[PDB]
Amino acid sequence: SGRGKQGGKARAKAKSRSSRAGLQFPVGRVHRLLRKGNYAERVGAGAPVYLAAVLEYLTAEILELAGNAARDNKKTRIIPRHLQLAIRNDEELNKLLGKVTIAQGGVLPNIQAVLLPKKTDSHKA
Amino acid sequence: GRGKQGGKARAKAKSRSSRAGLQFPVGRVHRLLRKGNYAERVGAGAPVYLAAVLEYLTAEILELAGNAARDNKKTRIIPRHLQLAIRNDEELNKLLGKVTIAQGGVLPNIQAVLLPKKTDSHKAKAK
Amino acid sequence: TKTQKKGDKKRKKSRKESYSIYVYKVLKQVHPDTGISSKAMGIMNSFVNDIFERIAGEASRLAHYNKRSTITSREIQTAVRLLLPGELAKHAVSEGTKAVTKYTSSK
Amino acid sequence: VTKTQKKGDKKRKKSRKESYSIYVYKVLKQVHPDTGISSKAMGIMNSFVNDIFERIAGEASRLAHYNKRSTITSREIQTAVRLLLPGELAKHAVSEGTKAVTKYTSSK
Amino acid sequence: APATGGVKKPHRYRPGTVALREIRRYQKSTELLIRKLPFQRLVREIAQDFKTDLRFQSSAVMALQEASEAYLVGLFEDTNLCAIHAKRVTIMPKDIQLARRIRGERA
Amino acid sequence: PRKQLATKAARKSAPATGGVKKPHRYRPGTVALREIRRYQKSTELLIRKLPFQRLVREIAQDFKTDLRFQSSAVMALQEASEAYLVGLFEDTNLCAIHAKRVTIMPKDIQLARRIRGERA
Amino acid sequence: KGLGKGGAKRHRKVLRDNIQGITKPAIRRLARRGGVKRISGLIYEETRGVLKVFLENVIRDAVTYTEHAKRKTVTAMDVVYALKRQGRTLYGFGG
Amino acid sequence: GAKRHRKVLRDNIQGITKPAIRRLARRGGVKRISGLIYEETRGVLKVFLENVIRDAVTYTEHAKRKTVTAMDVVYALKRQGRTLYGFGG
DNA sequence: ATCAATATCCACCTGCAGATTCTACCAAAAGTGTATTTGGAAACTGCTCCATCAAAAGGCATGTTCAGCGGAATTCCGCTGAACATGCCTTTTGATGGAGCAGTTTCCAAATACACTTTTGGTAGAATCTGCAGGTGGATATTGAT
DNA sequence: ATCAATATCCACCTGCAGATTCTACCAAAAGTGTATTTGGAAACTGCTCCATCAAAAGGCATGTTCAGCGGAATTCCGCTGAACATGCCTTTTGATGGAGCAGTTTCCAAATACACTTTTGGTAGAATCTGCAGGTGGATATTGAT
Ligand SMILES: C[As](C)(=O)[O-]
Ligand SMILES: [Cl-]
Ligand SMILES: [Cl-]
Ligand SMILES: [K+]
Ligand SMILES: [K+]
Ligand SMILES: [K+]
Ligand SMILES: [K+]
Ligand SMILES: [K+]
Ligand SMILES: [K+]
Ligand SMILES: [K+]
Ligand SMILES: [Mn+2]
Ligand SMILES: [Mn+2]
Ligand SMILES: [Mn+2]
Ligand SMILES: [Mn+2]
Ligand SMILES: [Mn+2]
Ligand SMILES: [Mn+2]
Ligand SMILES: [Mn+2]
Ligand SMILES: [Mn+2]
Ligand SMILES: [Mn+2]
Ligand SMILES: [Mn+2]
Ligand SMILES: [Mn+2]
Ligand SMILES: [Mn+2]
Ligand SMILES: [Mn+2]
Ligand SMILES: [Mn+2]
Ligand SMILES: [Mn+2]
DSSP: OOSOOSOOOSSSSOOOHHHHHTOSSOHHHHHHHHHHTTOOSEEOTHHHHHHHHHHHHHHHHHHHHHHHHHHHTTOSEEOHHHHHHHHHHSHHHHHHTTTEEETTOOOOOOOOGGGSOOOSOSTTO | OOSOOOSSOOOOOOOHHHHHTOSSOHHHHHHHHHHTTSOSEEOSHHHHHHHHHHHHHHHHHHHHHHHHHHHTTOSEEOHHHHHHHHHTSHHHHHHTTTEEETTOOOOOOOOGGGSOOSOOOSOSSOO | OOOOOTTTTOOOOOOOOOSHHHHHHHHHHHOTTOEEOHHHHHHHHHHHHHHHHHHHHHHHHHHHHTTOSEEOHHHHHHHHHHHSOHHHHHHHHHHHHHHHHHHHTOO | OOSSOSOOOOOOOOOOOOOSHHHHHHHHHHHOTTOEEOHHHHHHHHHHHHHHHHHHHHHHHHHHHHTTOOEEOHHHHHHHHHHHSOHHHHHHHHHHHHHHHHHHHTOO | OOTTSSSSOOOOOOTTHHHHHHHHHHHHOOSOSSOHHHHHHHHHHHHHTTSSSOEEOHHHHHHHHHHHHHHHHHHHHHHHHHHHHTTOSEEOHHHHHHHHHHHTSOO | OOSOOOOOSSOSSOOOOSOOOOOOOOOTTHHHHHHHHHHTTOOSOOSOHHHHHHHHHHHHHHHSTTOEEOHHHHHHHHHHHHHHHHHHHHHHHHHHHHTTOSEEOHHHHHHHHHHTTSOO | OOSOOSSSSOOOOOOOOGGGGSOHHHHHHHHHHTTOOEEOTTHHHHHHHHHHHHHHHHHHHHHHHHHHTTOSEEOHHHHHHHHHHTTOEEESSOO | OOSSOSSOOOOGGGGSOHHHHHHHHHHTTOOEEOTTHHHHHHHHHHHHHHHHHHHHHHHHHHTTOSEEOHHHHHHHHHHTTOEEESSOO
């Protein structure tokens, strides 16, 4: 009630579940999203810890690749295009998101070889 | 009436299926909707409704499968009949488009271009 | 007699439910003199289980998108329209509201 | 004075929409300290997380029903992750998921 | 024909005529076309790379065979459309490949 | 003293003996290849925005009268439609090339849609 | 249906033939992004037809979610859920 | 290392014989088949079985069994977008 | 092979519209702590139904044609790209009424829960019975050669 | 056209594998009636944001001209698959120990429910940053004319 207390100590107060699990992603939210999502009558304590880890991990994987595509384009800010390039250029992320479309992501530069110009000449072209 | 009943004549009962006028098991459809983790609650009409739909689709396939059996001079429906009925019905085929009926085979069908040329046999019109 | 020999093996096999009897009843309404093999019956089972999950699943999502806690015949209905091809839907919708009506009009 | 802004309001504040945003942002600063993200790319990262979340939870849900189990534990999440992610993505997710559960339980 | 085959004796159906007969025979029936045991062996071998010392319910192998053949027959149908598209009547690898790329089984 | 004193859109010598100008013309397929690299490099929507919105209101209206749309609902439809057409054109292109052609034709689109099960 | 009263309202103006707003240059550009180098004359009409079917199907489902929510406004989320069920998950608008 | 012995060798995948692949093609309505089709078909079947079996076995281990069940396969097939009716479920 | 011509690449420059940065402020999560229940791992084990194998059984590996398919090569016609003139409608900026989302609070028709009663579907045998596969035989359409 | 050969169809037959039908039990549902709780319609309303109206202008659509070169028709031959004659070996069919799938009892670690506190992420709106869009401007690449 009010400001609070001259606390901010360091020794025996609460410890977030994320912190307890060494995660940036929110364990408490994942747990809540799991119970509310009607997935099973019950959700064990480890479930959200494990799921938050996998989600944090995957976003870590995608951000690493997208950040690089940003760098390759001489940009500082990841935009949707970067996310696409990183997803389509990585086989696994591409298979994981094979049925997904990234708005404003475009496609990968790719021209079927027979379409390329045939070194001038006659004969065929 | 006005002054009747005084002893024993009425009990109580009636299955939900019977009340809904259905062959499929409402009660069970209901239990399955609750066990399924579809929502915290399940209204009383949903299992009725769901049951009638399942019954109806079942009679549509059975009806057509039945005909396919009769067409082959068969009395007992087999999977081939279920497949012939399904794949020959435009809508059923759409609904079951990513389903395979074990032991069903396929609809006989040969691409035009693969048939022999020249002409054809059997007196296809004459005397 | 009625065997009360505990040695005649008191196994107790966990019982499996299936829609066979109900599929059979329906068969009898549409084709009284037609049978169905057990294999064919397995297919119809698969069929009922599959449509049931597709519809429940869709009704489930529908109620969640709408922040609703219960699945009503209404969700089952929108699910049906989303799932079935045109005429199948019309009829299934018609069959469905009909059973719900008969049902309510008979307490 | 100045204690207020003349308001004279009739409630109706917001509703509050959550998103993985500050967390997508924390993870980004860790792999690329000097890289930022457009709100539209964040938009997409948000969709991805929700998407993968539902795929795993869903698969986890089915796995449990198929086994007459009424609770989703780390073990269901684990096989859902193996069923959903390909090759190497699965190996590493599994190992990092396992690691977080062990650390989380070595705790009070 | 009669040629000088089995001590003279004629009759040879032209190339293709028997192929068409086979098509009619096989599209008319439902049995499995791959021999059981070999199939079984391939299945157990592939499973061995995922988890050693496994047993298989006979019905699991059967479902896998049923699923695999319906898949190949279906793939052969698309493959045949790709051959015809290219004005051939002979399916080739590039046709199986094109159908798989377009089906998204891709790469 | 500027009498259009530009060095030259050409240069040196004087082989201006003859009477041949002959304007520059790209060969067929060069501008087209150029357009592929240009469009495969960008992400902006390619169908004009207002016309697309009208198409969406007309189809929707034919299903149900009196509907309104959030503008992002329309944008969602367009990003999905253009992502779908680009994807179909890639498959269509493979169907044509499969045919030893370089020109996509209706039948290539039909073949790709049949194989995708949009026609099965 | 609420919308429609006459007097202070109405005369919406008839919508028709809008499929022609998917111009030839627009379809050409889409083909280019799709890596297409040469386009037969009949492609344009074929493409309009395929687009129309794609959109009818998605709007049909998006509109069904709208009506189910008892709303009169189609939402980005209606379209997104429609897309997801049609196998075309879209990231970027509230996924 | 056993079970096949003398006279015969041939890996298991070669057990999927030309005649059987030819029969499949015929059900597929195929009239003429190039030689290279047989090996191409085996690699395809192999990929199909790996993907399916891998998932079925994942269901087995999770249920802690030693026996791949029809249901394990059916659920795997369903995951792979290859729903199969007739074997339970 | 040059080498005009034009496209395009890649760096530089710098406002400004998105982005990162706060200073509240709050409700609403999220974390504590303490009862109360219970899901399912563990252990033990009976009884299916697997894996293995001998005889039986019937498919396929092989080699030799040669029909007919695929694809090279040649050839034009006319479709489709490139370019260009012209001018329109989409884009952009911006204001504005008000439809209709989306908070909020008031409730009861309907759902959850329980407890006890009544019924049914699943299982086990058991004893029939029955559709139709597969076998026969003769006719007759089809295919291929002459 | 005309036959010879061989595949195919159809009508009939009948054993048995797979239905089907009859007790007999039974526990697991399914129904019933009796509190108690509660989602989620109404109803009322503030407040986004959707529809429209305007108006200016240049990015881009349209319609045209012309001709390069791609599509498709044709011819032709070399090669690659189809057909075929059957003995040979792998697969098929059908019993049989024993591995585990699947019952069934047990009992705690861990989940739920709930009272209470404490921490946090979302939001708001005003600053004040800053990448980079987009406007140049020269390299250097590429393409098309000879
Ligand atoms: C949208 As309409 C004019 O086709 O009804
Ligand atoms: Cl857990
Ligand atoms: Cl209801
Ligand atoms: K206003
Ligand atoms: K009970
Ligand atoms: K040429
Ligand atoms: K050519
Ligand atoms: K050969
Ligand atoms: K051969
Ligand atoms: K404990
Ligand atoms: Mn040269
Ligand atoms: Mn701004
Ligand atoms: Mn218990
Ligand atoms: Mn030819
Ligand atoms: Mn209003
Ligand atoms: Mn009974
Ligand atoms: Mn029995
Ligand atoms: Mn017969
Ligand atoms: Mn005979
Ligand atoms: Mn003749
Ligand atoms: Mn309430
Ligand atoms: Mn004009
Ligand atoms: Mn044992
Ligand atoms: Mn904070
Ligand atoms: Mn720039």
